Amino acid sequence: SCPVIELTQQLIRRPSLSPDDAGCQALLIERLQAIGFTVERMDFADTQNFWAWRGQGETLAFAGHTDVVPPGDADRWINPPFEPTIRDGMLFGRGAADMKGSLAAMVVAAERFVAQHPNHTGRLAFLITSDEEASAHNGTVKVVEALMARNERLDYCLVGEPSSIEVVGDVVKNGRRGSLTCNLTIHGVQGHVAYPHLADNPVHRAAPFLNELVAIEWDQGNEFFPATSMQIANIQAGTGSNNVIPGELFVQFNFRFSTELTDEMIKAQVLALLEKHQLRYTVDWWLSGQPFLTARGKLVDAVVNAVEHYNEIKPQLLTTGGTSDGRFIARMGAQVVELGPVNATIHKINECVNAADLQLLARMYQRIMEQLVA
Amino acid sequence: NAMSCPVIELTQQLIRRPSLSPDDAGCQALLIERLQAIGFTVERMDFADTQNFWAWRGQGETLAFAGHTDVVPPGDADRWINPPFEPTIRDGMLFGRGAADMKGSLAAMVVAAERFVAQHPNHTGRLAFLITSDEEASAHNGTVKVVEALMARNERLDYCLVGEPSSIEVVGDVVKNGRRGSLTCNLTIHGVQGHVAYPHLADNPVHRAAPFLNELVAIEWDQGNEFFPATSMQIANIQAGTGSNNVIPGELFVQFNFRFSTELTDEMIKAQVLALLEKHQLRYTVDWWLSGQPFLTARGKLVDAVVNAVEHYNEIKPQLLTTGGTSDGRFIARMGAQVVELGPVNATIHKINECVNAADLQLLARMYQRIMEQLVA
């Protein structure tokens, strides 16, 4: 009997391409209801979510997503992406690593924990979405809005996103950068190269602004974050003709920003720089996430202790990579840490996860439950 | 009135031929029959899809008239008052594709030749025509290939009048005595593509290029001269990225064009750009293309004859300018010829309801004839 592997395989075969749950939450809700959880479904548009809880008081929530990213050309995978296969101790399939293995490990951890501590003094909760990977307008963000609107208690959140580099627990994420995109259009006057005095080239007018923008140091980072990083992802002007002076320049730049900056600080600094260079512009901002950091506390201690119990060495506490639905849950004032399997193969062809690592992760999750909720 | 209006008659005949570049649509056969009838020798020079001819009468000091039989597409036939290939006279104006650019000029210069030869049958100079069926499109197989053939055999060509429509309001108010060169740089700045989450593994070529672009757009190239404005540099195109806000691009494309005066060589422009690229320690690939060299006829017998002919018939001296419209002048300038452009009002060229003033065509033919008499009688 391998309940963690068996449940992971059941999840992988369900092709839950965001935002379609494809029956994953029906499986998890059955398991949680069987050990005494109250489940509230919170479905918005085409996204399925649930908030499940057992007990009262000091609250530890496990967070995760049932959705997976598309497999790409399925016929190029060694085994079909939705046909989980074990070979040489690796479980292959879309979502094996991101993050159906983690979902299975946290459900089985809860079953083993509730068996050991049927009258645990704390509250154990799950916050599960069918859209973390795509637009995510209708997933965890909407559950958190609902929970904050009813003054829900949530002290600690373990996000099961695959945090690990080479072995489970080598790395845990104790924070994530914000992401803010500036979609900037510099307006000029379109014309012809034969008569430049009748045109105003926005590429020429923008050049001093772009030179200053790429030289700015936005912050110096802190103990847990590197310096805020600004990158020009896209730039475009012209019709493809060598005799047209373009009328518009489009520049898109992204900020992956530390807790040293807010989106409003970055926006004000950018608008000030546009004003200093006297540009005519239209701007559209995208805020895809706010930074969060859990520097210390009972949750960090519990995660470090659970990992150390098996690995001896403490996990590195990092803020690397993208973000997670932790960014939403952090709005509740919760401590938020991410612990999950090796992330090397996420979003790639032949995604897989070490089966022994999933079993170990389930034991680490159970130890976190025991420390915080028993 | 065809028996007393030979310029208008030959213009309307040409307009009827849908000579969309590069199809002559039979226009050159009409010009060749008229020149052969007055003792020209004609040498057709056809290259692939394009028809050209070199025609001459007499010997020695040579004045060539240059022009093209091709016209640009009419566009939306519904927006035309009369069909674009159905020449119509309304209010002293001849309407039709090519009326202004440049079938009126072609008619004027052929009739001027007929009158000139009638007046000076044993003229002491050589009068020539260099006609192409592709000035307006690629022009790979037009005037450029004729000039290559003439230069290969050391053909004499002292003076060239290009009949491109030069005028603003009244025929002869402007003559073009030069044109700017055109030089384009297709620049790639090389970087290393990556992901915004891991910027130290990438090298954003937009960021590396920003100081270079800032300096490039601030350079002053020349201050032009009596006949040219300052050399003009414009960035026509710039592109980088995949369209995703999470990708650091690996390559930046920049295209910039120079419209340069006779005061600067293409060599000097390229050197300054390479010096700036090297100063900025960039990884790059450049692809240069020279569309044309500048040319200038500041003074001499041709400028005098054109100015004298226009003044004789208008009593106002043409402005001598170097911008606006296009011509094959730059190719003929390679032969060391004096090159000037005189033609009708250019307001309606490449537009719906293109037209030319009928009386202005008659006057242009007389100006052309006076230029022939001054230089090759």
Ligand SMILES: [Cl-]
């Ligand atoms: Cl198992």
Ligand SMILES: [Cl-]
């Ligand atoms: Cl949805």
Ligand SMILES: [Cl-]
């Ligand atoms: Cl336990």
Ligand SMILES: [Cl-]
């Ligand atoms: Cl208990």
Ligand SMILES: [Cl-]
């Ligand atoms: Cl444009």
Ligand SMILES: [Cl-]
């Ligand atoms: Cl957020």
Ligand SMILES: [Cl-]
């Ligand atoms: Cl006439």
Ligand SMILES: [Cl-]
């Ligand atoms: Cl012949």
Ligand SMILES: [Cl-]
């Ligand atoms: Cl005469």
Ligand SMILES: [Cl-]
């Ligand atoms: Cl004679």
Ligand SMILES: [Cl-]
């Ligand atoms: Cl970084």
Ligand SMILES: [Cl-]
């Ligand atoms: Cl970079």
Ligand SMILES: [Cl-]
């Ligand atoms: Cl790229």
Ligand SMILES: [Cl-]
């Ligand atoms: Cl040239």
Ligand SMILES: [Cl-]
């Ligand atoms: Cl001279």
Ligand code: NA
């Ligand atoms: Na309790």
